Design a protein around this ligand. Structure first.
Ligand SMILES: *[C@@H]1O[C@H](CO)[C@@H](O[C@@H]2O[C@H](CO)[C@@H](O[C@@H]3O[C@H](CO)[C@@H](O)[C@H](O)[C@@H]3O)[C@H](O)[C@H]2NC(C)=O)[C@H](O)[C@H]1NC(C)=O
Ligand SMILES: *[C@@H]1O[C@H](CO)[C@@H](O[C@@H]2O[C@H](CO)[C@@H](O[C@@H]3O[C@H](CO)[C@@H](O)[C@H](O)[C@@H]3O)[C@H](O)[C@H]2NC(C)=O)[C@H](O)[C@H]1NC(C)=O
Ligand SMILES: O=C(O[C@@H]1Cc2c(O)cc(O)cc2O[C@@H]1c1cc(O)c(O)c(O)c1)c1cc(O)c(O)c(O)c1
Ligand SMILES: O=C(O[C@@H]1Cc2c(O)cc(O)cc2O[C@@H]1c1cc(O)c(O)c(O)c1)c1cc(O)c(O)c(O)c1
Ligand SMILES: O=C(O[C@@H]1Cc2c(O)cc(O)cc2O[C@@H]1c1cc(O)c(O)c(O)c1)c1cc(O)c(O)c(O)c1
Ligand SMILES: O=C(O[C@@H]1Cc2c(O)cc(O)cc2O[C@@H]1c1cc(O)c(O)c(O)c1)c1cc(O)c(O)c(O)c1
Ligand SMILES: O=C(O[C@@H]1Cc2c(O)cc(O)cc2O[C@@H]1c1cc(O)c(O)c(O)c1)c1cc(O)c(O)c(O)c1
Ligand SMILES: O=C(O[C@@H]1Cc2c(O)cc(O)cc2O[C@@H]1c1cc(O)c(O)c(O)c1)c1cc(O)c(O)c(O)c1
Ligand SMILES: O=C(O[C@@H]1Cc2c(O)cc(O)cc2O[C@@H]1c1cc(O)c(O)c(O)c1)c1cc(O)c(O)c(O)c1
Ligand SMILES: O=C(O[C@@H]1Cc2c(O)cc(O)cc2O[C@@H]1c1cc(O)c(O)c(O)c1)c1cc(O)c(O)c(O)c1
Ligand SMILES: O=C(O[C@@H]1Cc2c(O)cc(O)cc2O[C@@H]1c1cc(O)c(O)c(O)c1)c1cc(O)c(O)c(O)c1
Ligand SMILES: O=C(O[C@@H]1Cc2c(O)cc(O)cc2O[C@@H]1c1cc(O)c(O)c(O)c1)c1cc(O)c(O)c(O)c1
Ligand SMILES: O=C(O[C@@H]1Cc2c(O)cc(O)cc2O[C@@H]1c1cc(O)c(O)c(O)c1)c1cc(O)c(O)c(O)c1
Ligand SMILES: O=C(O[C@@H]1Cc2c(O)cc(O)cc2O[C@@H]1c1cc(O)c(O)c(O)c1)c1cc(O)c(O)c(O)c1
Ligand SMILES: O=C(O[C@@H]1Cc2c(O)cc(O)cc2O[C@@H]1c1cc(O)c(O)c(O)c1)c1cc(O)c(O)c(O)c1
Ligand SMILES: O=C(O[C@@H]1Cc2c(O)cc(O)cc2O[C@@H]1c1cc(O)c(O)c(O)c1)c1cc(O)c(O)c(O)c1
Ligand SMILES: *[C@@H]1O[C@H](CO)[C@@H](O)[C@H](O)[C@H]1NC(C)=O
Ligand SMILES: *[C@@H]1O[C@H](CO)[C@@H](O)[C@H](O)[C@H]1NC(C)=O
Ligand SMILES: *[C@@H]1O[C@H](CO)[C@@H](O)[C@H](O)[C@H]1NC(C)=O
Ligand SMILES: *[C@@H]1O[C@H](CO)[C@@H](O)[C@H](O)[C@H]1NC(C)=O
Ligand SMILES: *[C@@H]1O[C@H](CO)[C@@H](O)[C@H](O)[C@H]1NC(C)=O
Ligand SMILES: OC[C@H]1O[C@](O)(CO)[C@@H](O)[C@@H]1O
Ligand SMILES: OC[C@H]1O[C@](O)(CO)[C@@H](O)[C@@H]1O
Lengths: 624, 624
């Protein structure tokens, strides 16, 4: 096998295991040392202020199985250190009858068993497991473990009556799934339920949701409440928090609710970040974030969504979360977002970016699959002085509108997402920064214009503000990972309101996905303005392209160009004329980013293994 | 609940857990500290000469499940010490996908992985498991672990290709079972196969049998050979060693071969003990020992059997063991016999004695279930100068006959079993011994005659030689655990050739089994003798009654009298007259025996637990 990246790629399926380990690999983000990873899990801020991040992990394999928690820590979300114990970087693994099929997603009770951080996780055992299969009760249960050494190891409660698993009864029949327990405190929900606690007897200070659905009848998020403060065995089922319809869609701005929820969480935000009021803060908004399955024809049939909700108290002492508006957390190849509280009134969200090799053609040659997104602060985005003539404004699809008293302006509210400032500062400070001259894209603009400074490798960030006429039909954006023969084009088209990533030329290697990514972006036009602005930030990190628009729209995707010189970048322009002009300013190239894993060598492969003929016999894991 | 043993028993099902722990409990034999035990496993003589004994174990439960190896050691088979590690007295437990359903029976490779003692055991996973169910491949596999600290702990090989499990392919389709690997060296089999090794390429110095059968078509013992000396991953299937018919019986002296084998082993014996010749010792005989299932209407549908076999070499380089004669290892409530080699050319066999509470009425009140038999030396029993007029002699049912040259006498050969001399010496030396005067049982003999010295508790041994007329119709034997109201009668009836244990009066507690035990005993009449002798030894140990006749016939059973004074013993006589007389001599009472577990307190209960509602959900174990 040839690794000559100055000529066309050969038959790369002849290459050995992990021979392509460093070729496309992200360097500036959270990723496992090697092998398979998927969903973030067990996220919490430790007593010293550092961040503990777990992830679904299958070392020395490139497909899912024996799923375990791998873990690492960081003081700044950006530079990480692996745990290293008897199971390497793993800290929780299948070990008991109740979890032998996989230690699935879980979340952290900060002050749990004997006061220690405690994880509530989905413990899986034998039987069909999946939204499209006939799953039975017991296959997915919920279990506890706690740590006395701040995440280096976890001790599970014993198996049995009054111990693990702690939640095992299905709250309704014919579930499509029953997993991903999300533990949270909520002054809001406590205040709302305070007059109903004699009906249910549940008076604890922790709530937990479990994600699932009902066969034939749509997804469900089930709400539980800790029965008694300071005690963690008994969790009382209150009722369904979120109920959606079988493949129901709230519209073009909102994905599709599919048939089953995964990795759902509940938070409360205000314009500054996390909100811990009981309802009294009128600027605060209740949100649910959730993945949906089987409501999408591509992207592994998965939508990572969010909804702003209004809580109502039911007669039986439960809560209905009524969806007020509903959006998309990321429009690309990402899923399984988790959020967790951080000091200084923050709620931080992170997801998993899958590869674009769905037929598993070069997975073994990679020697790993998957990475995280960047860590994102959540907040309520507020846009004042919005013009009522903004096209489609009053659909209020993934946003809310509040008219001024005179009816001449609107205040828009939606979910804000922005990369955590610790990462932006570290990235910028460690990079070679080029501040580029502003550019008018007019009749003289080429289709592609390389920046006056170019990246030196596949690790960089771009930023720019694109100013468009209110009635423009021009398109503009950024080309990245570009040589003459390979390139990835990121376009915004204000007339259609579509942000696209065109990947028909992203790689000479034909086995990788090449479908066009698409996100909807609403440019809220400002009263008195004669133009509208798209602020676009793009992170290029090995094969990851992660795009942020206006601290609101995120789109993560993959590009795998073969050629060593497919690293360039510049401006894209289409239909720009003397009359239809696009002004581009605030242009910066951050070349290099940071090495997110300073203790790791470049090649952290430990080889790949096969589980042997018993993998097919047990029928649980692919085995490689 | 009342524990007053001077009055009739109340409703003992009202008693708490382990309140009857010491009431019926053996003291002088191998038994777990508490909870459920079954089959012996992992038996081997350690480097210091001590004996390591494992057993199938489920602590803090009184039914089978999560089956593990519990273990202890002894320098004399008699006084034992528990291992004590992180899992108490357990040393191997379910921990991996391949063995999570249970660590079933296994046997020892004395010089295995890196030269260490190594166990090959049945690792079980999910799915229907049983001879009467539709079991599938993978549910039962065979796996390796080794010990670097002579049995205090075991390290399993890793899961995967070229590692555990090491044997997983079914050698034939539609197996009724696939377990209990028995590893052994055999100069005999090596000599027989030496001209066929180019056909199979299997040239290792270890063989292994796996016990099972084929649905609808009877039991099978499958023979494997280690592929290469010094290497323990590859075991080559040669062919079926023993093939028997669906519920076939060799006759009244031989039990029934049922539908499936369990815990089968292979040995070679001569008149002094174990034989390690290649075929050249003409006094040596090849034997197979094996349990059978579903060929019996009672005794949990289980026969512990043995067969003398003649090996034949097949064209494909495998061995057929042709049954020459076939017997019963124990006629009572015992099963799962294992044998292992011991220094000084010995082969030692031990089994499991189950309780007689098959409806589980007082199991929780006991707080334990099960014990071992005594440890038994195996050898070829030889009886010279046998009269050809011995009734039924030439059926050669569970014995062989060789005529003298003149046809006037016969040499009888069969499987001998006798309690290991270390135990007999320790028992006798620690007991208060009463040597009793010989007794003629004639017209004046009462039905029951108490011995002139009586036991002081439920821990004693009796011995006696009963001399019968050749044409007697009299019956005689021993009554044990006897007061006026409760007693257990052990009768021999030479005319019918039946040894019986009548248990209609064994206990006032009606929930225990009361069926009559029966064994066949052949009294080989000696040329010129005018009488025939039954040598009977009986061990009474809590609730265990273990009977040995003529170093040949064993019968283990249970009696649970309530009354504190139901400990007496004496002679039984029926149909003895002036003309039909039974002479009883060599009479001894050994009162007390030994405390087999000197470091254990009397009550080693640690309470019982329930597995909770998930036990029924997983459907693998009863859960208590
Ligand atoms: C490279 O990694 C693989 C693990 O992915 C190492 O093990 C090999 O794994 C492949 C599957 O990826 C196994 O192939 C399978 O073989 C069976 C038949 O033998 C076939 O039925 C399946 O469809 C599949 O082809 C392969 O047997 C297995 N090889 C082993 C265990 O030796 C492989 O060893 C790694 N290579 C190196 C040099 O480290
Ligand atoms: C005495 O030992 C038992 C374990 O055998 C301890 O746990 C209890 O176990 C029994 C089963 O033996 C459980 O009963 C079951 O309850 C469910 C319904 O609640 C019923 O569906 C079943 O048919 C069966 O009756 C019992 O719940 C369980 N009790 C527990 C966990 O508290 C028992 O605790 C031990 N007692 C003492 C004082 O230690
Ligand atoms: O979310 C939890 O606290 C909230 C977030 C948070 C944080 O990030 C760091 C910190 O210094 C304090 C802190 O107080 C938050 C909080 C504030 C309140 O006013 C309140 O009533 C509440 O229940 C909560 C939480 C979760 C837990 O699982 C837990 O056991 C606990 O004690 C607390
Ligand atoms: O039908 C599947 O299992 C069977 C039905 C079933 C159930 O209804 C409840 C339960 O407690 C266990 C359970 O095991 C069954 C099973 C059947 C088989 O034939 C088999 O090979 C197997 O591994 C197991 C199946 C299908 C699947 O597609 C799948 O991914 C899976 O894990 C399992
Ligand atoms: O906190 C911001 O607004 C406040 C909260 C808020 C809301 O939750 C919903 C809503 O209908 C209106 C609204 O007005 C608030 C506000 C308060 C002020 O004192 C102020 O000067 C202002 O412009 C506004 C904010 C944050 C921003 O990041 C921002 O860009 C902005 O224009 C405003
Ligand atoms: O279940 C069907 O699609 C799923 C539901 C769905 C939706 O509600 C809106 C939407 O924008 C896309 C969409 O894709 C879903 C889907 C799921 C899959 O697993 C899949 O393989 C696929 O092609 C697609 C379906 C039903 C049909 O009746 C049909 O004819 C068809 O081709 C497909
Ligand atoms: O302008 C509104 O029309 C539609 C939405 C829309 C958009 O999202 C983006 C865009 O580039 C153009 C656009 O034109 C749409 C439209 C709808 C019509 O019925 C129509 O005749 C037309 O010319 C054009 C509008 C405004 C609103 O505020 C609103 O609530 C609504 O339902 C609709
Ligand atoms: O885009 C503008 O600057 C460019 C981008 C940029 C930045 O992101 C951060 C920063 O520290 C400095 C900075 O200098 C850039 C720049 C580069 C040149 O070579 C140049 O000639 C120039 O006028 C400028 C801009 C915007 C403005 O709003 C403005 O009024 C102006 O004069 C210029
Ligand atoms: O020897 C270096 O790492 C070791 C090899 C290695 C691997 O093969 C696969 C893998 O999954 C992880 C991995 O970590 C190893 C390692 C071991 C240590 O003791 C250590 O302190 C460390 O940072 C790491 C090294 C070399 C380097 O060149 C380097 O810059 C560095 O930080 C470290
Ligand atoms: O049965 C095994 O040896 C036999 C019994 C035995 C013993 O009890 C103690 C002892 O001092 C030696 C000993 O030699 C036995 C033996 C004798 C031979 O002449 C022979 O050819 C043979 O293979 C064997 C055995 C099993 C094993 O599993 C093993 O790895 C091994 O090395 C040996
Ligand atoms: O039918 C039994 O299992 C089902 C059939 C089956 C198989 O054919 C192969 C296999 O790989 C797994 C497997 O799981 C199946 C299963 C079905 C169920 O409905 C169920 O509740 C369960 O625990 C499991 C069964 C019956 C039994 O009587 C039994 O003791 C047992 O453990 C299992
Ligand atoms: O070793 C015993 O016999 C030897 C072995 C043996 C056999 O295997 C089968 C057989 O057909 C006959 C047979 O004759 C052997 C024998 C050898 C002698 O030197 C001898 O004096 C004798 O009586 C006999 C033995 C052991 C005994 O325990 C015993 O009671 C007894 O009478 C004899
Ligand atoms: O399978 C039947 O018995 C089993 C085989 C068998 C034998 O071969 C000889 C013998 O001495 C006893 C004997 O007991 C077996 C048996 C197994 C059981 O599981 C059981 O519950 C039982 O009563 C007994 C059976 C068949 C029949 O055709 C029948 O009518 C019946 O009542 C029973
Ligand atoms: O004596 C033999 O008869 C039968 C077997 C036998 C036994 O086991 C114990 C017993 O108390 C008595 C007994 O009488 C049986 C017997 C069979 C008959 O056909 C018969 O006419 C008779 O009177 C009585 C005999 C001897 C043998 O040596 C032999 O091989 C055989 O098949 C049979
Ligand atoms: O049964 C016979 O002894 C009795 C049992 C027995 C034993 O088992 C071992 C031992 O060390 C001594 C021993 O003394 C027993 C005995 C007890 C008496 O009270 C007594 O009067 C007597 O003659 C005897 C016997 C057998 C004989 O073969 C014999 O010739 C004889 O005189 C006597
Ligand atoms: O305290 C005694 O044992 C402990 C209690 C106990 C139990 O409750 C349940 C059980 O499964 C085992 C068990 O073993 C315990 C024990 C602990 C030790 O440290 C020790 O050395 C020992 O021999 C044993 C004791 C008392 C006694 O009276 C006695 O004679 C004795 O040997 C030991
Ligand atoms: C990039 O590499 C290719 C092949 O090595 C070459 O054709 C091309 O001219 C190079 N430089 C570019 C596109 O700037
Ligand atoms: C470089 O990145 C590291 C790791 O996140 C960070 O701690 C450091 O401050 C950065 N350097 C700068 C901003 O100069
Ligand atoms: C044994 O105990 C019972 C009841 O306590 C009593 O009736 C009997 O006489 C006692 N002694 C015997 C049988 O020797
Ligand atoms: C060898 O022959 C026997 C008897 O035909 C057969 O049962 C066995 O399976 C054969 N061995 C093989 C196929 O390895
Ligand atoms: C008593 O039994 C112990 C334990 O087996 C044994 O070592 C000792 O020799 C026995 N005492 C005798 C025979 O006097
Ligand atoms: O790895 C299993 C985990 O991944 C998810 O399926 C999301 O893709 C979660 O619902 C689950 O806990
Ligand atoms: O506990 C399981 C073990 O017990 C047996 O069934 C014998 O009764 C063995 O065949 C098996 O290994």
């Amino acid at each position: 096998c040839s690794l000559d990246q100055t000529v066309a790629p050969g038959n790369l399926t002849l290459c050995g295991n992990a021979t392509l380990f460093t070729t496309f690999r992200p360097k500036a983000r959270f990723i496992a040392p090697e092998g398979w990873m998927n969903a973030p899990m067990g996220l919490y801020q430790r007593a010293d202020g550092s961040i503990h991040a777990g992830y679904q992990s299958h070392p020395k394999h490139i497909q899912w199985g024996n799923i375990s928690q791998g873990a690492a820590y960081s003081s700044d979300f950006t530079s990480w250190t692996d745990f290293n114990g008897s199971e390497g970087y793993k800290t929780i693994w299948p070990s008991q009858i109740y979890d032998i099929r996989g230690v699935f997603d879980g979340s952290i009770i900060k002050e749990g068993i004997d006061g220690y951080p405690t994880i509530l996780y989905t413990s899986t055992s034998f039987g069909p497991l999946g939204a499209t299969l006939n799953e039975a009760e017991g296959t997915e249960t919920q279990s506890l473990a706690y740590t006395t050494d701040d995440g280096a190891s976890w001790i599970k409660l014993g198996y049995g009556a009054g111990q693990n698993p702690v939640i095992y009864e299905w709250p309704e029949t014919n579930l499509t799934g029953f997993r991903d327990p999300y533990v949270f405190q909520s002054p809001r929900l406590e205040a709302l339920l305070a007059n109903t606690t004699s009906i249910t007897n549940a008076t604890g200070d922790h709530f937990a949701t479990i994600s699932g659905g009902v066969h034939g009848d749509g997804a469900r998020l089930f709400l539980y409440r800790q029965h008694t403060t300071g005690e963690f065995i008994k969790w009382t089922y209150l009722g369904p928090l979120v109920t959606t319809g079988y493949k129901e869609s709230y519209g073009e701005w909102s994905g599709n609710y599919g048939i089953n929820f995964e990795t759902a969480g509940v938070t409360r935000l205000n314009p500054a970040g996390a909100a811990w009021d009981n309802g009294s803060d009128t600027t605060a908004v209740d949100f649910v974030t959730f993945g949906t399955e089987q409501g999408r024809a591509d992207h592994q049939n998965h939508w990572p969504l969010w909804a702003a909700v209004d809580y109502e108290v039911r007669d039986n002492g439960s809560i209905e979360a009524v969806i007020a508006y509903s959006g998309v957390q990321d429009w690309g190849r990402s899923y399984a977002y988790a959020s967790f509280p951080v000091e200084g009134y923050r709620q931080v969200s992170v997801g998993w970016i899958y590869e674009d090799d769905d037929n598993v053609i070069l997975a073994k040659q990679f020697g790993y699959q998957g990475a995280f997104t960047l860590f994102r602060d959540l907040f309520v985005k507020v846009v004042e002085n919005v013009s009522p003539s903004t096209p489609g404004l009053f659909e209020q699809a993934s946003w809310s509108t509040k008219n001024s008293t005179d009816g001449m302006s609107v205040t828009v509210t939606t979910l804000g997402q922005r990369v955590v400032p610790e990462t932006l500062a570290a990235y910028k400070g460690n990079s070679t920064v080029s501040t580029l001259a502003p550019v008018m894209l007019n009749e003289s603009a080429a289709a592609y214009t390389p920046f006056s400074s170019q990246p030196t490798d596949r690790f960089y960030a771009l930023t720019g503000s694109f100013e468009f006429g209110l009635n423009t039909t021009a398109k503009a954006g950024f080309r990245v990972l570009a040589s003459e023969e390979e390139y990835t084009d990121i376009w915004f088209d204000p007339a259609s309101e579509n942000l696209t990533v065109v990947r028909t030329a992203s790689s000479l290697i034909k086995s990788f996905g090449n479908d066009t990514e698409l996100a909807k972006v609403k440019l809220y036009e400002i009263v008195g303005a004669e133009s509208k602005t798209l602020n676009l930030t793009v992170f290029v990190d090995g094969s990851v392209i992660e795009i942020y628009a206006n601290d609101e729209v995120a789109l993560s995707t993959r590009a795998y160009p073969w050629l060593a010189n497919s690293t360039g970048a510049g401006l894209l322009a289409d239909g720009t004329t003397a009359g239809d002009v696009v002004g581009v300013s605030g242009l910066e190239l951050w070349d290099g980013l940071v090495d997110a894993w300073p203790a790791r060598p470049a090649n952290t492969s430990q080889g790949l293994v096969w589980d042997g003929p018993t993998a097919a016999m047990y029928g649980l894991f692919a085995g490689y």
